[PDB]
Design a protein around this ligand. Sequence first.
Ligand SMILES: Nc1nc2c(c(=O)[nH]1)N[C@H]1C(S)=C(S)[C@@H](COP(=O)(O)OP(=O)(O)OC[C@H]3O[C@@H](n4cnc5c(=O)[nH]c(N)nc54)[C@H](O)[C@@H]3O)O[C@H]1N2
Ligand SMILES: Nc1nc2c(c(=O)[nH]1)N[C@H]1C(S)=C(S)[C@@H](COP(=O)(O)OP(=O)(O)OC[C@H]3O[C@@H](n4cnc5c(=O)[nH]c(N)nc54)[C@H](O)[C@@H]3O)O[C@H]1N2
Ligand SMILES: CCCCCCCCCCCCCC(=O)O
Ligand SMILES: CCCCCCCCCCCCCC(=O)O
Ligand code: SF4
Ligand code: SF4
Ligand code: SF4
Ligand code: SF4
Ligand code: FES
Ligand SMILES: [Mo+4]
Ligand code: NA
Ligand SMILES: [S]
Lengths: 975, 61, 61
Amino acid sequence: KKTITINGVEMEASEEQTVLQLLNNSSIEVPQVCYHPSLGPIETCDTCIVSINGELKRSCSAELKDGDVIDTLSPDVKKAQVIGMDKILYNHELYCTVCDYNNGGCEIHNTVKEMKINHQSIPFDHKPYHKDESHPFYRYDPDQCILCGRCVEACQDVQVTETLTIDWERKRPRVIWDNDVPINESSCVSCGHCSTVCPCNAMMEKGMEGEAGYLTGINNETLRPMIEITKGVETGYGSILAISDMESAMRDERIKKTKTVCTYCGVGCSFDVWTKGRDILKVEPQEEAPANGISTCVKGKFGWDFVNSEERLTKPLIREGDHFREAEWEEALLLIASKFTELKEAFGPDSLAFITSSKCTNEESYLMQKLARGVIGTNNVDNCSRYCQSPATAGLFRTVGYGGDSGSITDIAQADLVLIIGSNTSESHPVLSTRIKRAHKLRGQKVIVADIRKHEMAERSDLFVQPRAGSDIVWLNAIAKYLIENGKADERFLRERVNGRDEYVKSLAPYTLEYAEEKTGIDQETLIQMAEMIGQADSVCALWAMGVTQHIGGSDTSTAISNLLLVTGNYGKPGAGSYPLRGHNNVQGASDFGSMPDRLPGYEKVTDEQVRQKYERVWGVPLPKEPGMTNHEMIEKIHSGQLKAMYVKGEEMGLVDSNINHVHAAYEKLDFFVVQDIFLSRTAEFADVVLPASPSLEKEGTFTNTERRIQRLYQVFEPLGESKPDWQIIMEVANKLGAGWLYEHPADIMEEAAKLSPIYAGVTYERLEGYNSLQWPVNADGKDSPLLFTERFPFPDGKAILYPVQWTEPKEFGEEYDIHVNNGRLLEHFHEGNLTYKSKGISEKTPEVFLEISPELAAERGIQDGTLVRLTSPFGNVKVKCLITDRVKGKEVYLPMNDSGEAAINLLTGSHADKDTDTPAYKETSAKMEILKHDGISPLPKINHRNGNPQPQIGVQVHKKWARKDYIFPGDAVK
Amino acid sequence: AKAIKRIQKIEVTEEDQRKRDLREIEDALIDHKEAILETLHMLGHMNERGVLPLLRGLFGQ
Amino acid sequence: AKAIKRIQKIEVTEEDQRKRDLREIEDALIDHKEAILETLHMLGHMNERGVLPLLRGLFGQ
Ligand SMILES: Nc1nc2c(c(=O)[nH]1)N[C@H]1C(S)=C(S)[C@@H](COP(=O)(O)OP(=O)(O)OC[C@H]3O[C@@H](n4cnc5c(=O)[nH]c(N)nc54)[C@H](O)[C@@H]3O)O[C@H]1N2
Ligand SMILES: Nc1nc2c(c(=O)[nH]1)N[C@H]1C(S)=C(S)[C@@H](COP(=O)(O)OP(=O)(O)OC[C@H]3O[C@@H](n4cnc5c(=O)[nH]c(N)nc54)[C@H](O)[C@@H]3O)O[C@H]1N2
Ligand SMILES: CCCCCCCCCCCCCC(=O)O
Ligand SMILES: CCCCCCCCCCCCCC(=O)O
Ligand code: SF4
Ligand code: SF4
Ligand code: SF4
Ligand code: SF4
Ligand code: FES
Ligand SMILES: [Mo+4]
Ligand code: NA
Ligand SMILES: [S]
């Protein structure tokens, strides 16, 4: 519809909203130092000065109108671009040959090179500030800062942390953290965004410092005079830029850049790891990254220290009495084969359970279940999804038929309303939450948060309701009853696409606004507001997590969320759907490949004689017909002499299963225990054999994130010592039992599995090369499914099922236990911290566990920060220091999982689990608090991000820069 | 079994480590076999030509 | 006899190939024996003349 003429030649414009966007697609040369597609226009560098109809204007912001005569080559437009560059060069010192950012991707470097610049009109003047090297992971060099505001745009509008601002009102502006405080003491969550988006070395990772270049190792005492000598000698910029380009090219010998998928959470961030030998220089995000783009959190951007930890297991360990003996791989494999065959012959195949890791790849999950079913002959397989989204997948299986999220993270950022129930979204799914925060902050997306703890999402929500623990289904059913009865339900959708409607409305009978107000504690008036916001929103994404599922009625509450979405017609359309946020990096993929007692890969039921027969023909052996034990059920079966062996890979069961006193008691009884891990975990201490496994960076394979997005990971480092990647170990164990498996690469395992799993039929490593991804179901033609239920629901009649659900009252511990111990995670730490405590930088700002006490409870019990208390439940006790904060209220406390001893939250939790999926009810834990010590150092240091002071704002405030006296627009330099 | 933490490491003797290190150098020579072979041919020509004896005498005297 | 095409190759083990490659490097040294011997004499004089120690110290410090 729009037709323009650039540089004389006329051509039609497609959907290019700006002149620069069109110039870029048209391959026309135009500087854009401050333009990053992920951030949008900023108008700070002033180097894109092109003539839009004779007027010199910044093309990054200029809207592409129909009939515009844009010129990007006249002497005046080029003289204006060089003027803008002169101010960038006045704020940035070029020293490329001895700069760690001279890796071919430096936007200042390549812009000076593209502009054929040989001299600098405004000489470089040092800014009157010192380098802020306080933070453990990155540093600020104000002298190299060009004040482009890319880091500010990222912190404010992409990450939505709001720490970074530019003090334009200052004599010599600079990027300030909070109200100009040192980086380490600020609210900086250490996401890495600001270092990623910075176009020069002004904001860089400390990992890059002195490592990337050949001459950057030279001490600053000798390197500084070298730069001053070179500056004086210099004939032209192009001469020394060629020298710097040759050195930049040489770096390709040392620095290895490898694509990987984050080993931490289910957001599924992919990025490149820059490694010089075994040292990780920086995690370099790429725009092509399907789930995250240039976004990362502290864990994926800087939490990789564990891979090189001196504590890494490099040799198999065989228990020799009161100690572990380092033994050869052959003896460890031979002993596992001898003992596994011994218990299989004497006690049966069902006396051996197998635990898959959701940290490990899809192929490794597939081989663990092929070992359990095809080699041992048992259906006793499972993964940490048991303690996680078993209730959420049970809910989706009952209503919409697919065990995954309805759509992509892109649909969440598009939603008109995001309902968040029991999910610390910015701490557990950081990059997924940046999409919600940006949509709410800038697009005006409605955000409803239902939670017992006031976390970032609750603080930023449009409506923050606080229901009583376990009462979530009561208000969810009431929203549906009110919307159905008030005629505000999507009757057109329910009609042709849903089943069991009248039986559903009959089950909603007790859930009246009065009952909901009584049981949940949310008043009827706000319940009306929730129902109206949900009903009036065109598209609603319902994101739920362990606040909903880690309960006795967790499967039912999850079903209620899906039922509500069916009622309001929020399925099969973009911007809407059910989003149970997937926990681990590969929990979705571990379940997708049959690491479940009831299902084989692709969620095909085990008891299905037709499915079993397919696998029998391919695997060449009969499959066990009867389902197996769950991850939780496994410790009960050891206690009753039924389970004589357990092969647990990458799972800290000795700390993460509920009631760890009972789990440890079971471990002493257990005949054979094989723990496969990268470290000697708490669980590994109870093992008879420990096998040294290699982490994500030391292997190839695929991970499936929260969006059912299958992503390939490339090997960064070779396996450390004699540690082998999990698939290689599982295969070698099976081969010791006569399996004869001949895989050479995980891609061989994937080819076999894609043929059998129907939802993975079209998945091939070729379709997943580089940043390419596939969302399941993937048919044999390679056509993926980014958005589920667009045409129909996967049921015989193509219609979803409304599922009658009842409230199951949360377990009551007793009158003596007056403290409701809420528990979860922390943004910076991953579970007990087996991986994140190895990261020194994370440990520096969060060195230990803490118990969040409300100011009310603190007043009543005389608690201050650092007060050692003793939470006692009918299952065990924890001794933990205290931290006062209004994040927690009244008698509900918060104990994060980041501890492996005295304060391990699972010493308090009980063996009570969900009635339908056996998911331990971790969010139903009560205890009584006894003061042990009064004075102690606060368990949260001053440098922790929670002790900050964000400065929220829309954008960079470039209008404040233009308001200065010294600001003269480069285009305005005509006369 | 019961919880244990103590690990008795495998004995890598001084002679065993020496063999590992020498074998690592042998493997590097094997990998750069063509480059070494070419260097030796080049060096042989420097000796046939006046070059190596001239340098031996320049430093010798 | 009847027509067959399948060829069962002889097993050249990793250690066997390593010996072959090392022996090839040994043979090259043997061929350039005089050149190597001359290089060593020249190198010995560079050390006596204090040229090698000077270079060792220049890079060392
Ligand atoms: N940084 C980090 N991220 C992680 C992980 C990690 O260890 N560290 N672990 C990963 C894993 S495996 C998991 S499963 C995921 C899920 O991670 P989330 O489920 O988002 O995380 P938690 O904080 O465990 O969730 C508990 C939240 O629900 C609230 N809550 C507790 N009980 C109730 C209740 O009855 N009703 C309501 N409405 N809210 C309630 C708590 O106050 C808290 O906000 O996170 C993944 N992401
Ligand atoms: N009180 C309470 N308890 C809970 C929870 C809660 O909210 N509250 N959450 C529950 C839930 S949702 C979950 S998922 C679990 C989390 O519990 P797990 O799934 O056990 O989680 P992590 O502690 O990350 O344990 C991962 C282990 O795998 C190892 N590892 C990492 N990479 C690799 C690899 O490549 N190969 C191998 N072999 N090992 C590797 C690590 O060193 C570590 O020992 O916690 C559960 N327990
Ligand atoms: C300038 C080129 C210098 C090349 C240095 C070659 C070093 C040769 C090492 C020979 C090692 C012999 C192995 C062994 O004795 O086991
Ligand atoms: C500049 C001249 C460099 C000459 C390089 C000589 C390389 C010596 C290789 C020694 C191989 C030893 C053979 C073996 O250990 O079996
Ligand atoms: S940041 Fe870029 S332009 Fe600046 S010195 Fe380094 S390589 Fe050169
Ligand atoms: S949170 Fe910290 S690291 Fe992340 S963008 Fe903001 S200032 Fe930068
Ligand atoms: S620190 Fe911020 S304003 Fe300065 S050059 Fe880097 S991204 Fe631009
Ligand atoms: S959001 Fe999750 S996947 Fe992304 S960097 Fe952080 S921990 Fe890794
Ligand atoms: S890209 Fe337009 S002013 Fe920076
Ligand atoms: Mo989980
Ligand atoms: Na950067
Ligand atoms: S998980």
